[PDB]
Design a protein around this ligand. Structure first.
Ligand SMILES: [Cl-]
Ligand SMILES: [Cl-]
Ligand SMILES: [Mg+2]
Ligand SMILES: [Mg+2]
Ligand SMILES: [Mg+2]
Length: 309
């Protein structure tokens, strides 16, 4: 009696093993293979964060739990999850072609990145729809953003509350909250890309809900191109804020990311920790959503709301 629908879960993607590093970054670098020294460094970074194997598993677990949960909280639709990635197989097109072959005719998509941007989200959705249009007989409704879903805000608000609560007294009174997301080229502004504003809005909503009056907005993990990228970078912001007010502790909320991957386990947990360790301040970074029940419910609500349920 249920209506069959495809659940297209898209994401950036991650290597499955150390030997994937080369091709994964070549793709990210738009066809330019990393030099020998860079390849070695990347391997060292992944080893330092506990290994690669767990990365892709988080995404698979996210897609799977979301599929099971949605199927349990409503009784009108039966969802079937398909993972589509940008930088490694299964690619976005591959997932769409599979849904078609399996007989899916109606699907709903969601990107594992809360803020809309013309660079990624719009591109992912555009590519999924074009593949479906090319195959025919299949339509897709795409979630464009969900950073403002109350349940998602609540997740971070609660994590931040716990973090400040566990803080000593003299730290709680001189702590700074830094909310960040993946940095992108500044040129996106020429299209009126709401990306920057959505990050600032997430920061305001999380700070307000947690009761934190002192916070800043930062970017991280910027790529390497001649054109300028959104700033300031979390590393510089941390130092700059310290040099002007001398905070004793920094709380990092990489709201732009949803899992324990390299741009949090290393770009925050290591690179940011280096700076805080250097200035003599305490480092804090709340648990990422990953595949936890609270997060999966938030995502389920996002999907159902998109479908008018
Ligand atoms: Cl939407
Ligand atoms: Cl949006
Ligand atoms: Mg091996
Ligand atoms: Mg919206
Ligand atoms: Mg970097």
């Amino acid at each position: 009696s249920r209506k069959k629908m495809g659940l297209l879960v898209m994401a950036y993607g991650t290597p499955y093993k150390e030997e994937d590093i080369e091709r994964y970054y070549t793709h990210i670098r738009r066809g330019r293979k990393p030099e020998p020294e860079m390849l070695q460094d990347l391997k060292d970074r992944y080893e330092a964060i506990g290994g690669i194997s767990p990365l892709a598993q988080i995404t698979e677990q996210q897609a799977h739990n979301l599929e099971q949960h949605l199927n349990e909280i409503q009784d009108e639709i039966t969802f079937k999850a398909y993972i589509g990635l940008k930088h490694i197989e299964p690619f976005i097109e591959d997932a769409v072609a599979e849904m078609h072959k399996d007989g899916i005719t109606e699907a709903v998509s969601i990107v594992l990145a809360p803020h809309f941007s013309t660079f990624s989200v719009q591109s992912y959705n555009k590519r999924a729809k074009e593949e479906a249009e090319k195959l025919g007989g299949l339509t897709i409704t795409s979630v464009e953003s969900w950073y403002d879903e109350p349940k998602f805000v609540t997740y971070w608000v609660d994590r931040v509350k716990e973090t400040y609560a566990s803080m000593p007294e003299d730290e709680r009174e001189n702590a700074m909250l830094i909310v960040s997301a993946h940095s992108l080229p500044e040129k996106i502004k020429e299209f009126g890309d709401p990306y920057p504003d959505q990050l600032h809005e997430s920061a305001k909503l999380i700070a307000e809900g947690a009761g934190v009056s002192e916070y800043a907005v930062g970017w991280q993990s910027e790529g390497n191109t001649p054109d300028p990228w959104l700033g300031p970078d979390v590393q510089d912001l941390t130092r700059d804020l310290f040099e002007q007010k001398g905070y004793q502790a920094f709380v990092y909320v990489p709201v732009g990311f949803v899992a324990d991957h390299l741009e949090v386990l290393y770009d925050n947990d290591y690179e940011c920790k280096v700076v805080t360790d250097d200035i003599g301040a305490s480092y804090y970074r709340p648990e990422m959503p990953n595949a936890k029940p609270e997060f999966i419910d938030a995502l389920a609500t996002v999907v159902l709301k998109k479908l008018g349920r």
